[PDB]
């Protein structure tokens, strides 16, 4: 189901509109500044049917592990506690995070060998491109 082409180590090379996304999330200024400077490495691995996404940066490291279609609790890098679910749709790995009464999505898709993460919260859309390394 999940392309084994997602598996590996990915390095952020381009980020667009991420400041606005973080602002939408209520991330404060000092954290936004560091957040915008970060160029995370994302490591995607699979163990059976459990996918792990590890995000590594000087500022913050996060790690989520899940099975597709199974709701899980996540503590995000900005310390939201969300109820999250990851599914595949059309080859894209779609992550929905819900908390209080909000929702944000992170879609990860492979585009010509690169991984493109689109982060969306209502009208705010970020695009983050990663290179496989
Ligand atoms: C991601 C490391 C930087 C940390 C910035 C801290 C607050 C950011 C809010 C969390 C959003 C994470 C969005 C991830 C999208 C992606 O994988 O590229």
How does this structure look, described?
With 133 residues, this protein is mainly beta. It has one domain. 12% of the residues lie in helices and 57% in strands. Strands 4-3-2-1-10-9-8-7-6-5 form a ten-stranded antiparallel β-sheet. Helix 1 packs antiparallel against helix 2. The longest helix has 9 residues. It is globular, with a radius of gyration of 14 Å. The relative contact order is 0.22. Palmitic acid (PLM) binds next to helix 2 and strand 9. It is found in: Cytoplasm. Its main location: cytoplasm. It comes from Homo sapiens. One of its GO terms (molecular function) is cholesterol binding.
Topology (SSEs and partners):
Elements: E1 8-16, H1 18-24, H2 29-37, E2 41-47, E3 50-56, E4 62-66, E5 72-75, E6 81-89, E7 92-99, E8 102-111, E9 114-121, E10 124-132
Antiparallel strand pairs: 1-2, 1-10, 2-3, 3-4, 5-6, 6-7, 7-8, 8-9, 9-10
This protein binds palmitic acid.
